[PDB]
């Protein structure tokens, strides 16, 4: 039963600050990133696509370009961590992570900006 979990389902962030939101997925110690797919989206806008062990920035939505990045050092630990720098008011909303690593699941995280 592949399950994605979230340490927090809501983040309150200050304007101009940096934000890192996380989704956790099961790792079996012999991690193969060629089988892992990580997808982050906010209101139908593509943020991250980590496929075939590579971040495909060719599909990144305009606002999230050069501000959004997946922390690849955390993937081996079973953590899909999306870092968004210089947070704007338009970054407030519902985010979703869709992870596939054998099975597949998804979780929603809300972000509020002050």
């Amino acid at each position, epitope marked *: 039963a592949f399950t994605v979990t979230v340490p927090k389902d809501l983040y309150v962030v200050e304007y101009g600050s940096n934000m890192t939101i996380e989704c956790k997925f099961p790792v079996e110690k012999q991690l193969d990133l060629a089988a892992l797919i990580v*997808y982050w989206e906010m209101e139908d806008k593509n943020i991250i696509q980590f496929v075939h062990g590579e971040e495909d920035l060719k599909v990144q939505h305009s606002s999230y370009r050069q501000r959004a990045r997946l922390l690849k050092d955390q993937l081996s630990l079973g953590n899909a961590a999306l870092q968004i720098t210089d947070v704007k008011l338009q970054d407030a909303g519902v985010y979703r992570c*869709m992870i*596939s690593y054998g099975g597949a699941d998804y979780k929603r995280i809300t972000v509020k900006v002050n």
Partner: antibody
Amino acid sequence: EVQLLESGGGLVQPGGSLRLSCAASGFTFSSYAMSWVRQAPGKGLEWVSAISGSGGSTYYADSVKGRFTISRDNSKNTLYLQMNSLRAEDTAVYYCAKSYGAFDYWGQGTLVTVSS
Amino acid sequence: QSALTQPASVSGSPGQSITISCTGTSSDVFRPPLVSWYQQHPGKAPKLMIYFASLRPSGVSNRFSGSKSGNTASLTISGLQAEDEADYYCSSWDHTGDGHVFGGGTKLTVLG
């Protein structure tokens, strides 16, 4: 290049048994979950069974539970479907499919005909 | 009886958009952020067109796009060509995250 070659199909009498095999190549077989998806002549796709990369976890559609067994050999890169107690309703083309977010690669299928 | 529901057929003139809808019968079978779409030509095996509701695999034409809204997933084909005539199937991961379900398929007709 990724290749999935199914074999083992043919005519089986009702209540009989058959084993299908799928030889995979062009990818690290043990890193991906694999599935068997079938399609009755002229009808739609039906998911049959899935197995994890290591072979430690197997999943079945309710229509084939207790009759079909999925297995894999991660040294010969081969996927199997052992079918027992076959029924006329199991007549279909059986596809071997690689799971990677979705079925990104499919074999060309093997026809299984259950008839007296 | 397929767990997912799509139209039996869709018809349309060439050089035009066309959308096929996918929907479920419960939450345990249909999860829109994990919807895949497949194209199947006569006598051929299915081909992955869209995965994760809107993601396009390498090799798939930019004329094929997918979207989701509420408890619905859609496949849109822009600039219809004659070669697009095929059966299209939607699929979703089940509630467990291990099994799968398929829609009953949609036969696409290019009317020109």
